[model samples]
Target: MLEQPYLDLAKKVLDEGHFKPTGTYSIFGHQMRFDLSKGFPLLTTKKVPFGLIKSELLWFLHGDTNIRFLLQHRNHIWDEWAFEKWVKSDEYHYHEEMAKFDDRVLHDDAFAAKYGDLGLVYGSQWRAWHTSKGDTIDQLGDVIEQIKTHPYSRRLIVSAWNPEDVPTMALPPCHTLYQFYVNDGKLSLQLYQRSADIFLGVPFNIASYALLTHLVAHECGLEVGEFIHTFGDAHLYVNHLDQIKEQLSRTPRPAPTLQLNPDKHDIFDFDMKDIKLLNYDPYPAIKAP
Candidate 1:
């Protein structure tokens, strides 16, 4: 039942959403709310890769912009974007000797610094916001501290969008902003994603933010609450219609519970092994690009 809204949204868009020139079936706006107290909101309809989510979220939490760190974790989710930058540079033209970049990023620290860093991506904006004063602001750390000090403050928010950095970014932030609210010793979060891909990305998006809500609550010593996902341009590609329908055909199973290391107070220190899911029995993964 925790993930029903996601399936319902998929069906709604399939039937009522508009077909677009870009070959995507799109709806203008949609929202889903997950109660963390119920269970983790991972879709039981299919097995979403929780490992990549753990590594990617931790990478973002650390304000890491380099694919080298991600590559070290064996997360290729961000590698392609950094690869594009590598391919477009004068270096690529020279390497039109056509050498493999992923290998270079791992073996050569200098090469990774030059090419593996994704400029002003989530980590760049989340952890370190560039200022006109030529210094940086730690937005995420400041926000968590705000939640600790002034839990009632309406201004407890962290944003990933930086207007100044947008023009040059390979892929602009899709999950643009997130806000935190604390009430009755429980913490809740709402994320506003500016661009959402329903079939391939939204499932990961749901579980990612839900886990984030839990992580923030863990550090703040608050009981977990809700994760509300608000979206802009939520859509399914024409190519993924069959796969979406296939997911819809399956019955939703009981959602699983998330377990985290109790002693990990500092979120930045948490690693992939610190997070775990209990009793996650799901249907096989459905593949789509």
Candidate 2:
């Protein structure tokens, strides 16, 4: 099954897990690889929301640092980080008022303009990497150029783990770095994540990078290759053992075929509507309980 790799990893972690201080069942280092040509890696055992993934990735591609674009698209995943920032700010220092942060960002233009900006998240780090010098560099764009002009070179890499940004960030990027490799007409990408919530976060991470590879390969006019995910701290919160067990209890369905619009050449040009996942028939599983 397409989802077996993930299931096995989860099972292995759950069985031979370490009880860590953060109330997590953790394993120090792990790797999971998926072949993009086989099918989209959206796990059938649990219905990973491709809609959310599509919207979020498109937002990151746009390089808009503000969560206004995400809110407009109903992508509230990063709202917590923005909310944390807003509450921490002296102007509106009220950590207890998280309930209305999303609402306020949606309704009040000024508040949204001020607080909606999620500094140094995926979009900012991937697109506009700020240096100590007063300027910006588009790491993603430069990487695409290399993949197109010279696919064989092993230097195709991008990093989001800025040490300077880490000290100030409320939540630094977990999926910290990624490197790309091209072989004979095929493109493969490897992601090195510093940390992940295995049961919850890893599923999305797998799908996100797999979709990413497909899109990049599409632009480069190369056949889709594998997305090799390497990790430093692959973990599951102890509280979520029941959930993983439930997902493990279920059988996986056939993998989905991801279709990209043939007309779009530049990966940045693609939008939510341009990316499509077809025939994803995961079990009729319940949502997080």
Candidate 3:
């Protein structure tokens, strides 16, 4: 049942989604909901690398905009965005960087710091937001504090899209804004993603937000409830159509449950070792563009 929502949505997009650009098909609006109580919403249809997800989420929680931590964890999800900045910089030629910049980032710390920092991406926007007065705001941390003080407050929100910072960034945030709700000793989350890559990105977004909800709930002494995901432009790249169809043919296994270290209540302090995905028997991994 957890995976059905995703499967159905993928199929719908493939069958009826409008074609645009070189070969991408997309639907205007779509939404999916998952009950965290049932199980973690990681897709069983494909092996979603939970380790990468864990590190990436932790990086965001730390408000670290630099890609150094991610590279250290061997998580290269944000490497391209950082590398794009490097490839376009004058320092690129000054350093005489090679085509394989990712290797340089991993093996060279000085190179990583100079070129791997992705300016105001999710980590920076979420953790170290610069103000007009020049002070930085910890949006994610502040939101967690608000959830603890005022559980019923409607202002429990953290936004990654800053209009002023948008003009200078390579890619704007796709999972733009999220709001949290608490009721009857349970916590829920709703994420509004601006643009979604159905085959490649949506699964990761679902699990990421679900993990966030669980972490915040644990920190606030509440049970996990639901994760509601809404999208603006949900699309499947044309090249991924065959892979999507192949994934559709596979049956979803029983959803896996996430185990967080009971002793580690502070989300900020939690590391990859503290979060474990128990018994995830997903199908073979599918790589897409």
Model 2 is weakest, by summed lDDT over 10 consecutive residues, at: 92-101
Error of 1 at 57 (Å): 0.5
Question: What does candidate 2's lDDT look like per residue over 124-229, in tens digits?
Answer: 8888998789799899999999898988888999988989879987778888899999988899999999998888788899988998899889888899888898
Candidate 1 residue-wise lDDT, 1-289, digit = tens? 9999899899999999998874888887788998999999998999898888889999988888888787788888887777778767887553432237777888899998988888778877888999999999988899999999999999998888877767876678899999999999999999999999998899999988999999989999999998999988999988898999999999988899999998888888788889999989999998876
Query: Least accurate stretch of 10 residues (summed lDDT) in model 3?
Result: 91-100
Please give the CA lDDT of all the candidate structures.
Answer: 0.88, 0.84, 0.87
User: Candidate 2 at residue 242, lDDT?
Assistant: 90
For candidate 2, the per-residue lDDT at 164 reads 88
Summarize candidate 3's per-residue lDDT along 1-289 as a digit string, tens digits: 8878899999999999999994789998798999999999999999898888899999988877777788788887887767778767887552334336767776788887888787777878888889999999988889889989988999999898989978876788998999999989899999999999999898899889999999889888899998999989999998999999999999988899998888778998778888889989888898775
Indicate the residue-level lDDT of 273 in model 2: 81
Q: What TM-score does structure 1 among the candidates reach?
A: 0.96
> Which is superior by TM-score, 1 or 2?
1
TM-score of each predicted structure versus truth: 0.96, 0.93, 0.94
Candidate 3 ranges with C-alpha deviation above 4 Å: 93-110
Clashes of each: 1, 0, 0
